[PDB]
């Protein structure tokens, strides 16, 4: 069920495989604008596809 | 990726152009007056006149005139001069 959980999240949203699982909540903050921009601009461009 | 969906429908007119063309034509044919170089005559004159004499020379200019003012027909020689 963990493998099926992440199967749906990476079929819909495959860019999630570039934020490693241990470095994920090191990004968060209390506000959404406070989230660390280490992966924000990379996640936005991997989400736009391979072209 | 969607480029071949827009090549399927080809040319298409603007979406109400038949009301523009039927509005410009209905202004050019419903003038309410004779047709620009002609004059309405009686039926007794129209049935009695040859079609070479109903024509005016001014209304048939020469299609590529060698002298400016050449006309193709000559009309009625029965002038009221």
């Amino acid at each position: 069920r963990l493998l099926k959980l992440w199967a749906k999240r990476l079929l819909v949203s495959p860019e999630l495989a570039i934020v490693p699982l241990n470095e994920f909540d090191a990004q968060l903050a209390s506000k959404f604008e406070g989230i660390s921009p280490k992966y924000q601009e990379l996640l936005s461009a991997v989400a736009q596809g391979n072209k | 990726s969607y480029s071949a969906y827009f090549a399927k429908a080809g040319f298409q007119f603007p979406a109400g152009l038949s009301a523009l063309v039927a509005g410009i034509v209905a202004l050019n044919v419903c003038t309410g007056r004779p047709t620009k170089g002609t004059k309405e005559i009686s039926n007794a004159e129209y049935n009695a006149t040859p079609i070479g004499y109903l024509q005016s020379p001014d209304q048939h200019p020469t299609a590529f005139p060698k002298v400016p003012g050449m006309k193709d027909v000559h009309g009625s020689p029965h002038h009221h001069h």
Partner: protein, 217 residues
């Protein structure tokens, strides 16, 4: 009954977006003294209901005149705005639209010896808006007819493909007048509809309704 499908980001969609947003920018809405929130939102929506659609009217007159002016530069075609009733019939119709808007600001009643002189200079706007479009489309095309007759007098008299430095200097003068006519075709459709926003925008003013009762602090 089935509408056509539009690609997003088409070039005619991008051009007409920028054209509409240009003419809408000519009569901008005025900022109220209050902050715009849900209290002031019906006063802002009612302020937009009482403004004339000059953003739509000016891009109607931009797009119908630049299409007519540029027909005169297509081969085998003449500009419809080179006709007196077409071009001045658009100028009177803008002037009457401004006046009907300004007459309705009251109850359709028409407004010492000063006011016949404000009226004359205002009634001349009617004919000046259309005649400026008509004479520009006529005087540019007429000069081109005269100079093509002069530039045809040289190869008719002299040789075909002979004595070519005489006709080259006038075929390049004819070519630079058709090029100026492309500039006058675009400018006079811009000047007609810049001025339509100015004339119609004079009577584009109503009272902001606003809050009549408040709970301060």
């Amino acid at each position: 009954s089935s509408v056509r499908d539009v690609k997003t980001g088409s070039l005619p969609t991008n051009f007409l977006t920028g054209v509409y947003r240009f003419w809408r920018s000519q009569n901008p809405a005025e900022k109220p003294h209050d902050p715009v929130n849900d209290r002031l939102l019906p006063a802002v929506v009612d302020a937009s209901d009482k403004r004339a659609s000059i953003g739509t009217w000016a891009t109607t007159f931009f797009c119908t005149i630049i299409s007519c002016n540029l027909l005169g530069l297509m081969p085998f075609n003449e500009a419809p705005t080179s006709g007196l009733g077409f071009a001045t019939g658009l100028g009177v119709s803008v002037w009457a639209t401004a006046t009907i808007l300004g007459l309705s600001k009251t109850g359709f009643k028409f407004p010492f010896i000063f006011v016949p002189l404000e009226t004359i200079s205002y009634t001349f706007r009617a004919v000046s808006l259309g005649v400026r479009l008509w004479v520009n489309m006529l005087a540019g095309h007429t000069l081109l007819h005269i100079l093509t007759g002069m530039a045809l007098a040289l190869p008719f008299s002299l040789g075909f493909f002979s004595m070519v430095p005489a006709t080259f200097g006038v075929c390049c003068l004819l070519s630079a007048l058709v090029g100026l006519e492309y500039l006058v075709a675009v400018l006079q459709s811009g000047v007609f509809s810049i001025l339509s926003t100015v004339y119609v925008g004079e009577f584009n003013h109503d009272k902001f309704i606003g809050p009549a009762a408040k709970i301060v602090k």
